[PDB]
């Protein structure tokens, strides 16, 4: 039996599935620890590993990219879970090594790979605590090329009056996604700051794990996965919307929650987003 993790319903994905909007022919790069392509509830279209020691992007050593991938696009069938965009074309972009880290250069390599291979949506369920002009150039170039660029806001919680949003989440060109729970309360770990754009489910998120497994993870990574999947649903109904139109559709149709510094625009509503972009007109 297939379970639809609550987060998928909480963002109103199923209303769009019933209308025939499932992310078909939308290319989503999961820029992360890779994706297990042997998983019965995931169909991996392609991808690349930018990790020196790790030539296979379909070998997920961190059990992270696979979980992100399953929130984006777990298949609609009689097993496992269900993705926000279950028909999306899923790309494994491995930029995190088995040791648990990656260089920004490997992230930029993934971003450049994603532009060159015509990804519609980049999800970066990862980040670091400091900026680089190079990383900003790279996400700015992705946005200039018409890619919808989604990143996890970071898991740094509150730090007095300061933005704790990670990079590349912090860059204006990137959609920075924070984490709420099933009550639409901000998760205590969710990074805060004026760079926060939207919230999505980020606590106790059931998804696919390597070796035909499922499990719950928490983090702004899980939240970003919902938003990247949401972007794919939107583009499967409005394929000519610009990345700016897709971003505005999500930001301008949210369920308003608390202060913008903690919740940005609030919880995404992909059903409302898919009606209209609300960019200018």
């Amino acid at each position: 039996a297939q379970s639809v993790p609550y987060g998928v319903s909480q963002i109103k994905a199923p209303a769009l599935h019933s209308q025939g909007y499932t992310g078909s022919n939308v290319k989503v790069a999961v820029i992360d620890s890779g994706i297990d392509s042997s998983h019965p509830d995931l169909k991996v279209a392609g991808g690349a590993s930018m990790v020196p020691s790790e030539t296979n992007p379909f070998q997920d050593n961190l059990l992270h990219g696979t979980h992100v991938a399953g929130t984006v696009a777990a298949l609609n069938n009689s097993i496992g879970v269900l993705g926000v965009a279950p028909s999306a074309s899923l790309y494994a972009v491995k930029v995190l090594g088995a040791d648990g880290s990656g260089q920004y250069s490997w992230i930029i390599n993934g971003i450049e790979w994603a532009i060159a291979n015509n990804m519609d949506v980049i999800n970066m369920s990862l980040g670091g605590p400091s900026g680089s002009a190079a990383l900003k150039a790279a996400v700015d170039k992705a946005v200039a090329s018409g890619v919808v660029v989604v990143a996890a806001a970071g898991n740094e919680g509150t730090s007095g009056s300061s933005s704790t949003v990670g990079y590349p989440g912090k860059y204006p060109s990137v959609i920075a996604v924070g984490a709420v729970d099933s009550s639409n309360q901000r998760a205590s770990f969710s990074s805060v700051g004026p760079e926060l754009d939207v919230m999505a489910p980020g606590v106790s998120i059931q998804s696919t794990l390597p070796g035909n497994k499922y499990g719950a993870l928490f983090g702004t990574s899980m939240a970003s996965a919902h938003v990247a999947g949401a972007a794919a649903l939107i583009l499967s109904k409005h394929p000519n919307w610009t990345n700016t139109q897709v971003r505005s559709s999500l930001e301008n149709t949210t369920t308003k929650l608390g202060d913008s510094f903690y919740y940005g625009k609030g919880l995404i509503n992909v059903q409302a987003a898919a009606q209209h972009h609300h960019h200018h007109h």
Binding site: V95, G100, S221
Partner: peptide, 4 residues
């Protein structure tokens, strides 16, 4: 970077 690291996973978020």
């Amino acid at each position: 970077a690291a996973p978020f």
